[PDB]
Design a protein around this nucleic acid. Structure first.
Lengths: 81, 86, 95, 77, 73, 81, 186
RNA sequence: AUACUUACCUGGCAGGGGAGAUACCAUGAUCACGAAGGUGGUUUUCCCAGGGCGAGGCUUAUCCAUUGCACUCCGGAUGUGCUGACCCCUGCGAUUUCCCCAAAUGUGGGAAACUCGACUGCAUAAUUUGUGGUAGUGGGGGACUGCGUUCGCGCUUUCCCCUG
């Protein structure tokens, strides 16, 4: 599987886009097998809305569109498992 | 899975796929993410088609609500739980 | 599945010879690929890993889309993680 | 008690032109003689005709297949 | 894989709601765990007032939204 | 089973509200509840997206096609809660 | 609004206007195809297999199985017994295998360097008929509390036969886990 | 109360941190001394995978004493919220049997046995949540068309701007 790699990105910063065009930038703290991720000290930006900083946010996996990971991530080393 | 256990009974705001925001007392959950909210109120953002007016908010009281996880996008803590102390 | 044993390797042969082999040869030869997603936007970039769920690990991607006169908009992402459900079509470099 | 599986098998043996509705599409419909079906509800037709309510044009397709998830309602002849 | 308790609506005239704002009306004869229903004396009930009866038909549970019994069971 | 499912099973026989993915909201007495969220109601009041209402006598709704449900607030005193 | 009543002002378009890939001669980096802890293991796994296989050819040319001073007597008469308890006295091995017939000579192999008992011996009967009587009966015998197997020695009879170290032999007491039962005997 | 034959009523399979290095143990390997590997141990580095020890260190009040002559941080104790090296187990809540240490009915160790948990893998991307028909595809200020009109507006056709 591949979701195990997603659960290893705790405490790192990424930018996830949602199926409704919403963007969310924050630090990861925990992920599940259903792709649901919990981000702490996060900032959300709904479509045609103003950004808001949230100290926590638990998101479901179905409504996720894609993620944006850092530039220095070790893919070759992190994909070994 | 303490990430979710730690938040039981807190006043969390659930984000719906249609853009609504359900703010209620998060009571319990499950593997499917089906939540139970107490004293929930529904908000929705309506676009102004008349002129450049402030976004229109239409509150709606519901009480006890059961949200299906499939329809839940995300959830955050709006504020601490209702304090029972004077 | 047809092979309910836990030692079944059906997924293995599938990615090697099945329709999902387009991504294997892409990561093997490090070839680019264009993906059409449910966002009405097209993502052109390389792949580094994937699974049965059609979730690819992309890098050096370039997003492209159009709004409305029709105006085009594009940006770049050096590392991202694409989901499978939101995908519509995939197209490798036809060269 | 007649079930959909047994009823679909009857329509197949009868080779009647069964019409099918599309998922999320009310304006588009398909009709043809069913040849077979699987547990996934996918249906194959020998001579399909795509008819629209607005246009009323029947586009000939021939031997084709249709996804079960796209099916909405079955109709005889 | 527990099936739905639709024994009450068996052999009763119902009106079902579909996904694309479509509705039908017929007498139920059988169901399945996936809510695949076979209703007879069914009418199309298009957007217009026109009515078209075809009789026996089948409906996929994936598209059934709500089903009301006009005969109050 | 799940705790939300148990809160639903015990809610059988009382007035509950149910909203579907098509936007309709159904409020009436609950007859039968199942683990898969399949709910049977009687003498319900439906609300369409436009706002118009209608009258029904006996209704059944699939569980997967429900957005959320509203149950009596008194259920909060359940022993599990 | 609803998914069915939503007015799609810009529905999903094709990809025909978005073909801007790189030219063919602009090939991908050849050195960007490798993985760690996946090939170095296979590389080491191939050498140990080949190294032994190459070492096998050298031993066959130097050592001759048939031309063995220890081996003596007719090959069809001699017998082979293995899985024998190390405490088995020479007289105990004679008196237990003499029931099937007289033993002309008996040879118990020992470790060349350690001198310990190997656990298998060669029994040479006076008559070829006496051996065959033991082939069926000796197999499965119990000597000193440990079951023993018995088969005609193929070191000089069967064409293309060789022992464990040369890739041949029989018995899978140390083969793939849970693939060879210990109860079953040769 | 025990065993035997039949009918009826209840029930989802695989498992027990993972990846490298093991010269040494077991498997005492079916061919005249031998395997390698593998399987089951023991030894040995780690993503640290969760815990136990809280020494040391960080924030701020309460109490006590000090009138002190320093220029190498530092008076003693309690409370709030944190961190934490080194050292230990590779992880079970419950039950059953054998042997042994023993302050000998308790406190523990070395063995398994098959029993529950919603711990994981596959049926789980094929209609009921864990792999989409909920796409996000706009709104507004000026000039700029037409139809109906209650002159507020519904639909409809254009250019430049602010907004996401």
């Amino acid at each position: 599987k591949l979701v195990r790699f997603l659960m290893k990105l705790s405490h790192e910063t990424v930018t996830i886009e949602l199926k409704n065009g919403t963007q969310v930038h924050g630090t990861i703290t925990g992920v599940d097998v259903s792709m649901n991720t919990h981000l702490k000290a996060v900032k959300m930006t709904l479509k045609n809305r103003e950004p808001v900083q949230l100290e926590t946010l638990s998101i479901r996996g179905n409504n996720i569109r894609y993620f944006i990971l850092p530039d220095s991530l070790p893919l070759d080393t992190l994909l070994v498992d | 899975s303490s990430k979710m256990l730690q938040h039981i009974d807190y006043r969390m705001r659930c984000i719906l796929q249609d853009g609504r925001i359900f703010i209620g007392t998060f009571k319990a959950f499950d593997k499917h993410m089906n939540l139970i909210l107490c004293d929930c109120d529904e908000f929705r953002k309506i676009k102004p088609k008349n002129s450049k007016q402030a976004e229109r908010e239409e509150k709606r009281v519901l009480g006890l609500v059961l949200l299906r996880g499939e329809n839940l996008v995300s959830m955050t803590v709006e504020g601490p739980p209702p304090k029972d102390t004077g | 599945e047809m092979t309910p044993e836990e030692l079944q390797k059906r997924e293995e042969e599938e990615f090697n010879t099945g329709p999902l082999s387009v991504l294997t040869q892409s990561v093997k030869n490090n070839t680019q690929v264009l993906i059409n997603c449910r966002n009405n936007k097209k993502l052109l970039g390389r792949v580094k890993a994937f699974d049965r769920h059609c979730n690819m690990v992309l890098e050096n991607v370039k997003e492209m889309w159009t709004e409305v006169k029709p105006v085009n908009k594009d940006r770049y992402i050096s590392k991202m993680f694409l989901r499978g459900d939101s995908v519509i079509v995939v197209l490798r470099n036809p060269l | 008690m007649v079930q959909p599986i047994n009823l679909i098998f009857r329509y197949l043996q009868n080779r009647s032109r069964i019409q099918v509705w599309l998922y999320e599409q009310v304006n588009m419909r398909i009709e043809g003689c069913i040849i077979g079906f699987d547990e996934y509800m996918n249906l194959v037709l020998d001579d399909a005709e795509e008819i629209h309510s607005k246009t009323k044009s029947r586009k000939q397709l021939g031997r084709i297949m249709l996804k079960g998830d796209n099916i909405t309602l079955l109709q005889s002849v | 894989a527990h099936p739905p308790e639709l024994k009450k609506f068996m052999d009763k005239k119902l009106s079902l709601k579909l996904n694309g704002g479509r509705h039908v009306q017929g007498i139920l004869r059988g169901f399945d765990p996936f809510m695949n229903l076979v209703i007879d004396e069914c009418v199309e009930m298009a957007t217009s007032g026109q009515q078209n009866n075809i009789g026996m038909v089948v409906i996929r549970g994936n598209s059934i939204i709500m089903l009301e019994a006009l005969e109050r069971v | 089973i799940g705790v939300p499912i148990k809160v639903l099973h015990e809610a059988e026989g009382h007035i509950v509200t149910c909203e579907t993915n098509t936007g309709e909201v159904y409020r009436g007495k609950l007859i039968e509840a199942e683990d898969n969220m399949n709910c049977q109601m009687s003498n319900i009041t439906v609300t369409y997206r436009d706002g118009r209402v209608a009258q029904l006598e006996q209704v059944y709704i699939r569980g997967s096609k429900i957005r959320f449900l509203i149950l009596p607030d008194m259920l909060k005193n359940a022993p599990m809660l | 609004k609803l998914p069915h009543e939503k007015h799609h002002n810009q529905p999903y378009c094709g990809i025909a206007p978005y073909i801007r890939e790189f030219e063919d001669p602009r090939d991908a980096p050849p050195p960007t195809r490798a993985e760690t802890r996946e090939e170095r293991m296979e590389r080491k796994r191939r050498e140990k297999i080949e190294r032994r296989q190459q070492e096998v050819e050298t031993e066959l040319k130097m050592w001759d199985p048939h031309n063995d001073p220890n081996a003596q007597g007719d090959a069809f008469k001699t017998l082979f017994v293995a899985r024998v308890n190390y405490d088995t006295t020479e007289s105990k091995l004679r008196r237990e295998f003499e029931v099937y017939g007289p033993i002309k000579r008996i040879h118990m192999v020992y470790s060349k360097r350690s001198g310990k008992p190997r656990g298998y011996a060669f029994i040479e009967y006076e008559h070829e008929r006496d051996m065959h009587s033991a082939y069926k009966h000796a197999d499965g015998k119990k000597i000193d509390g440990r079951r023993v197997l018995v088969d005609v020695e193929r070191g000089r009879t069967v064409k293309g036969w060789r022992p464990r170290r040369l890739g041949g032999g029989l018995g899978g007491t140390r083969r793939g886990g849970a693939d060879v039962n210990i109860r079953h005997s040769g």
